[PDB]
Write a protein that binds this ligand. Structure first.
Ligand SMILES: *[C@@H]1O[C@H](CO)[C@@H](O[C@@H]2O[C@H](CO)[C@@H](O[C@@H]3O[C@H](CO[C@H]4O[C@H](CO[C@H]5O[C@H](CO)[C@@H](O)[C@H](O)[C@@H]5O[C@H]5O[C@H](CO)[C@@H](O)[C@H](O)[C@@H]5O)[C@@H](O)[C@H](O[C@H]5O[C@H](CO)[C@@H](O)[C@H](O)[C@@H]5O[C@H]5O[C@H](CO)[C@@H](O)[C@H](O)[C@@H]5O)[C@@H]4O)[C@@H](O)[C@H](O[C@H]4O[C@H](CO)[C@@H](O)[C@H](O)[C@@H]4O[C@H]4O[C@H](CO)[C@@H](O)[C@H](O)[C@@H]4O[C@H]4O[C@H](CO)[C@@H](O)[C@H](O)[C@@H]4O)[C@@H]3O)[C@H](O)[C@H]2NC(C)=O)[C@H](O)[C@H]1NC(C)=O
Ligand SMILES: *[C@@H]1O[C@H](CO)[C@@H](O[C@@H]2O[C@H](CO)[C@@H](O[C@@H]3O[C@H](CO[C@H]4O[C@H](CO)[C@@H](O)[C@H](O)[C@@H]4O)[C@@H](O)[C@H](O)[C@@H]3O)[C@H](O)[C@H]2NC(C)=O)[C@H](O)[C@H]1NC(C)=O
Ligand code: NAG
Ligand code: NAG
Lengths: 61, 219, 210, 198, 193, 48, 219
């Protein structure tokens, strides 16, 4: 298993357990501000989205 | 109808439609949103627009529109114009080329407890990513993202009436069949503002094309 | 609504939306402009028309709508219909269908220190001169000219909005997560430029547009 | 402005003019005189069976409330008012096929010391002209423009053709008026007859 | 007429056009609906829509708009703008283009006992499901569903609207002299339920 | 009537396949008239 | 801004938009009319229509909208909604199937002198005799006749702003080249009325078609 962070932007930190070997932090900007999404895996992102995939425990933030 | 004439005169003598209908400004207005799909009008695969006929049922409590039925002849349940009260500013976020918000201002049904039911109709032209690789045997998932345009989640809360869109009055289409449909509520938080959420309800419909026309006339 | 109603009466009892928010006539109203493109609907080549869906973020200041949170129980912001406040009549100049204004006149957000934010959405059919030489392998340069319809550059001034890092957003903003590409058209560049021009009479007031 | 504004105060505030009341007794009908001018024939769509016309409709009726003595108002002899201030017979094209019953531009009325009201609203009308295809492309078509009031009946208003004068003799105008100098013929349709009937 | 103006002022003193006429709580308003087809414009198969031009025939009773004619110089009928009186919120439910309303705002005829007759014109694009199996030798069954959008059965009650003939009609009325038949379509049956 | 043509005339293809071409032209003729729904097939399309 | 609000309050206290804005009813309103051509949208030859984008600049003086700037904080110009004031009723007489009059009621600029400048946009759909004799090498001459619909020359006088239409902001047309452009004022007298002229201003444009499209795709 592997522990990843899964909270949204600037929210209190929360964690979850998952079977993938990578955590991901995905950051993008819309008309209102900056959204940060945290989870497991290494998803495919649309162009223009900052993606940070890491392979160790609790490495999102 | 003189009791209801008295009541309608009383209710809108000091009424304000700009500010939210709450006792205290620290309370959010609780709105229940349900989508009824009457007819799938068109799926334009070139411009990527789904045209549907819908009814957008919205339910909420107006704190200042309550009355004692015993003071007005036992009247409990009235119909008033929607133009003169506060409403949610529900906008279709992914509107392609139609109307962003409700433009047909039908009547509000109002209880003596201040409960408001408002079911205006709309023609929703929604942008949908259309996959044409399997055409005419293609499967399309198209959505309607609805939200309060100028109210965040701390001042107005929108709740789904049901997890399914209402399809009980849905007219059967000659070109598409709806295999599944659902509605999901989403909370969005921004890095600058940890405290205020932004709520949306995205209804989606998975549709399968009936391929007989293109089988006979092309293949 | 016990404090929002108080604030509304405090602000809009003596207020004129027909007048600019300036203490002196010679002052200029500064307006931060951002344009978010939701969808690129089409480019009709026979009609030479670009159809787009946009959200126009407009930010400015109104000293007559100033208040403080502490004197109204903590009301940080107030949402009012856009007809009750003075607006800068931003219009798309190079429209082809005769439509200059926005599609939905949304509520304006009035914040504490007179700050006013307005995000109306619009459907715009604009003029695009289609250069035909390399059709169907062509690329096009389509323009969106935004300008105040009634005020000159000495009464209404345009600046671009800024991001969380303070960098000036001199482009069309696009929600990269929510964007669906047009089935025929790919957007390669979207620069934004503020232009200032000399007035219709030498020495008189100038004109500006984005 | 002085006598114009004085006359407007006299007619609409001193006399308390009511546009909802028709200018007649309860059992009397108002005589409305109608004439039509064809500015241009735009098209006759065959598949849609639709005639599109630019037509200026001339309406005349006497309103005894909107009368004055010219010598009491500086010899003023004509007044121009918005149509939303006076009583209108509300003449519409019954024969339309797109839902556009009403005239296009609600222009000013002209009122006179006798109480006569003149109104020349221009309009663009899409009407149903069924097509006879038997002799196509050598066919001729018979289209019509039917004008009536859906707000009033025969007991309230009376429709008639416009009366014009030549050499002191009156005649009803029984034709569509076409200005010969200004008219441009349609590219594929030539007009043979222009009658008018009540 | 001055007596007409005084009557109109008397009737509309304290009158609310947004309030249903119901003297007692629980009283229904009986609304009689008929329809006159002026022209069947089209049946577009590619859009599954029938375009018609019609005249509605709405009859009901407003108790508030009654008067004694002998106290008002014999006036027993009035022609009042429709926005000034309470209307039933009757709409074409199976519209295909998003339009629910009538084409033109006209007068409502009010009798001295409170009887209301409203005959607005309408252009309607209603929804028709085309059965394609025997095209172009086909026949089609196109419906126009009229209903009060807001009021339910406990408030507004509907009935089929009688023709100028005083009998229980079940039919769309067509004036046989002024109706030009569609060159593509022949009307076999035109009932009303 | 193509089967009544002699083989030595060398015109069987030039008749039958051009009849097919004309039928394609009439398919183009009806392409903008028939309903586009897929619940059933029009009998005229069955005949074509 | 308070001086401006007070000025607007006084200016429209005893104002009548129906009255022609002159001191004496026996003199005419002096109006200057200029036409600015932004874009030649289309020349439809079958129905003989020319659709154009224009700005219709109208200048006059309102007698009742004067003020001394020293009594109002030095303000000299204000912006006023056009629906609040008297306007000339300019109509395209040779309109084909578009709008007869101005429908977009923009704001006017008003000076302390009483000078009103109003520059609304319009889409002009004008009827034009089209000569197809030399097609695709044809030259067309299309006109826009403009006049006060209900006011005659004795009560409202209209003069052209310049001899020619303004083409300074004309977008290039890909199908036509405007070779000539001018504007002419016409006085029209009738036999029954020798004292009241009827005035019009006709702006004509001589256009030459670029024939490359029809050379390549037809000839
Ligand atoms: C395209 O299309 C278009 C169309 O759409 C076109 O256009 C066109 O063009 C043309 C050109 O080319 C044009 O023509 C022009 O016009 C103009 C205008 O007209 C108008 O007006 C006028 C004026 O009036 C006024 O006056 C008179 C007298 O004189 C009177 O009567 C009136 O009433 C008025 O009065 C008023 O005012 C004044 C001022 O102004 C004052 O003073 C007073 O008091 C008052 O207030 C007029 O006249 C006219 O009328 C006429 O016409 C009509 C129609 O139009 C008719 O209906 C009438 O009846 C008349 O007729 C008569 O005349 C004629 C001529 O005109 C003849 O033809 C006949 O037959 C008859 O007889 C109107 O209304 C005008 O003006 C011009 O004229 C000129 O020329 C002629 C020849 O052509 C001559 O005769 C004359 O005399 C003149 O001459 C002059 O000028 C010139 C230039 O322009 C020069 O060259 C010469 O030399 C001379 O000069 C002199 O004089 C001047 C003045 O004074 C001065 O300034 C200088 O310095 C010198 O001294 C013409 O005609 C037209 O119109 C148009 N149209 C429309 C727009 O529509 C185009 O072209 C096309 N394109 C292509 C094809 O490419
Ligand atoms: C897509 O279209 C755009 C136009 O909508 C193109 O942008 C333009 O590019 C041209 C050059 O190709 C620039 O023209 C230059 O302008 C400068 C500056 O102009 C000076 O004079 C004007 C008054 O006449 C004044 O207002 C200015 O402030 C300057 O003082 C000249 O020095 C050059 O000689 C030349 O004329 C346009 O200005 C520019 N428009 C802009 C930036 O708004 C764009 O290049 C196209 N994109 C492509 C094809 O990739
Ligand atoms: C609003 O009021 C506060 C308190 O007087 C002041 O400090 C601030 O500068 C004002 N803001 C504006 C826009 O004048
Ligand atoms: C109008 O003209 C007549 C002509 O006889 C004259 O007597 C009168 O004084 C003039 N003025 C007014 C105001 O009637």
């Amino acid at each position: 298993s592997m522990i990843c962070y899964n909270q949204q932007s600037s929210q209190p930190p929360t964690t979850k357990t998952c079977s993938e070997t990578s955590c991901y932090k995905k950051t993008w900007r819309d008309h209102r501000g900056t959204i940060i999404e945290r989870g497991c895996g290494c998803p495919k992102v649309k162009p223009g989205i900052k993606l940070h995939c890491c392979r160790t425990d609790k490495c999102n933030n | 109808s003189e009791h209801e004439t008295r009541l309608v005169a009383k209710l809108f003598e000091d009424y304000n439609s700009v500010v939210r209908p709450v006792e205290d400004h620290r309370q959010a207005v609780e709105v229940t949103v349900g989508l009824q799909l009457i007819q799938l009008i068109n799926v334009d695969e070139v411009n990527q627009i789904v045209t549907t006929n819908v009814r957008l049922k919205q339910q909420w409590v107006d704190y200042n529109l309550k009355w004692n039925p015993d003071d007005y002849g036992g009247v409990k349940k009235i119909h008033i114009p929607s133009e003169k009260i506060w409403r949610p500013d529900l906008v279709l976020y992914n509107n392609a080329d139609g109307d962003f918000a409700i433009v047909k201002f039908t009547k509000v049904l109002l209880d003596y407890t201040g409960h408001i039911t408002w079911t205006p109709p709309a023609i929703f032209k929604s942008y949908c990513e259309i996959i044409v690789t399997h055409f005419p045997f293609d499967e399309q998932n198209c959505s309607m993202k609805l939200g309060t345009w100028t109210y965040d989640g701390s001042v107005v809360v929108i709740n789904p009436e049901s997890d399914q869109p209402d399809l009980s009055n849905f007219m059967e289409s000659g070109e598409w069949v709806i295999k599944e449909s659902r509605g999901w509520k989403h909370w969005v938080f921004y890095a600058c503002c940890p405290s205020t959420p932004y709520l949306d309800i995205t209804y989606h419909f998975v549709m399968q094309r009936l391929p007989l026309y293109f089988i006979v006339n092309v293949i | 609504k016990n404090e929002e109603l108080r604030l509304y009466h405090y602000l809009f009892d003596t207020y004129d939306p027909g007048r600019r928010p300036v203490q002196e006539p010679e002052d200029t109203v500064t307006i931060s402009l951002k344009v978010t493109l939701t969808n690129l609907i089409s480019l009709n080549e026979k009609e030479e028309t670009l159809t787009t869906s946009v959200w126009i973020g407009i930010d400015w200041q109104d000293y007559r709508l100033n208040y403080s949170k502490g004197d109204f129980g903590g009301v940080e912001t107030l949402r009012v219909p856009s007809e009750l406040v003075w607006l800068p009549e931003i219009v798309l100049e190079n429209n082809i269908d005769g439509q200059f204004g926005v599609a939905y006149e949304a509520n304006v957000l009035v914040s504490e220190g007179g700050y006013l934010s307005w995000l109306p959405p619009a459907i715009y059919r604009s003029t695009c001169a289609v250069e035909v030489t390399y059709f169907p392998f062509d690329w096009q340069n389509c323009s969106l000219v935004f300008r105040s319809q009634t005020y000159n550059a000495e009464e209404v001034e345009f600046v671009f909005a800024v991001d969380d890092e303070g960098k000036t957003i001199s482009k069309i903003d696009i929600d990269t997560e929510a964007y669906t590409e047009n089935g025929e058209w790919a957007i390669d560049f979207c620069p934004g430029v503020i232009r200032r021009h000399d007035g219709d009479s030498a020495g008189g007031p100038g004109e500006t547009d984005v | 402005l002085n006598e114009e504004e004085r006359l407007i105060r006299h007619l609409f505030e001193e006399k308390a003019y009511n546009k909802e009341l028709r200018p007649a007794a309860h059992k009397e009908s108002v005589e409305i005189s109608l004439a039509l001018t064809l500015s241009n024939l735009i098209s006759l769509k065959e598949v849609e069976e639709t005639l599109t016309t630019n037509v200026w409709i001339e309406q005349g009726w006497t309103d005894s409330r909107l009368q004055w003595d010219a010598e009491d108002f500086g010899n003023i002899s004509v007044l121009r008012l918005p149509a939303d201030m006076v009583w209108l017979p509300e003449i519409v094209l019954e024969n339309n096929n797109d839902g556009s019953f009403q005239i296009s531009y609600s222009c000013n009325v002209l009122i006179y010391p006798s109480g006569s009201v003149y109104w020349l609203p221009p309009a663009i009308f899409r009407s149903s002209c069924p097509i006879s295809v038997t002799y196509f492309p050598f066919d001729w078509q018979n289209c019509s423009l039917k004008f009536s009031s859906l707000k009033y009946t025969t007991k309230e208003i009376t429709l008639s053709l416009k009366q014009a004068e030549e050499d002191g003799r009156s005649y009803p105008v029984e034709w569509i008026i076409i200005d010969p100098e200004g008219f441009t013929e349609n590219g594929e349709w030539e007009i043979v007859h222009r009658p008018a009937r009540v | 007429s001055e007596a007409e103006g005084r009557l109109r002022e008397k009737l509309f003193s304290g009158y609310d056009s947004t309030v249903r006429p119901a003297r007692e709580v629980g009283d229904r308003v009986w609304v009689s609906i008929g329809l006159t087809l002026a022209q069947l414009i089209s049946l577009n198969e590619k859009d599954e829509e029938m375009s018609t031009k019609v005249y509605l025939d709405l009859e009901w009773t407003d108790y508030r708009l009654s008067w004694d004619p002998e106290e008002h110089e014999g006036i027993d009928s009035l022609r009042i703008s429709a926005e000034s009186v309470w209307l039933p919120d009757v709409v074409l439910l199976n519209n295909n283009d998003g339009n629910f309303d009538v084409a033109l705002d006209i007068n409502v005829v009010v009798s001295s006992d409170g009887s209301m007759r409203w005959q607005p014109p309408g252009i309607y694009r209603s929804s028709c499901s085309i059965q394609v199996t025997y095209f172009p030798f086909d026949w089609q069954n196109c419906t126009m569903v009229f209903s009060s959008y807001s009021y339910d059965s406990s408030e507004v009650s509907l009935q089929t609207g009688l023709s100028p003939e005083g009998q229980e009609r079940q039919e769309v009325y067509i004036h046989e002299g002024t109706f030009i038949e569609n060159g593509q379509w022949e009307i076999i049956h035109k009932p009303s339920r | 009537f193509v089967f009544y043509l002699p083989p030595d005339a060398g015109e069987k293809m030039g008749l039958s396949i051009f009849a097919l071409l004309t039928l394609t032209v009439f398919l183009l003729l009806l392409a903008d008239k028939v309903p586009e729904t897929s619940l059933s097939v029009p009998i005229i399309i069955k005949y074509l």
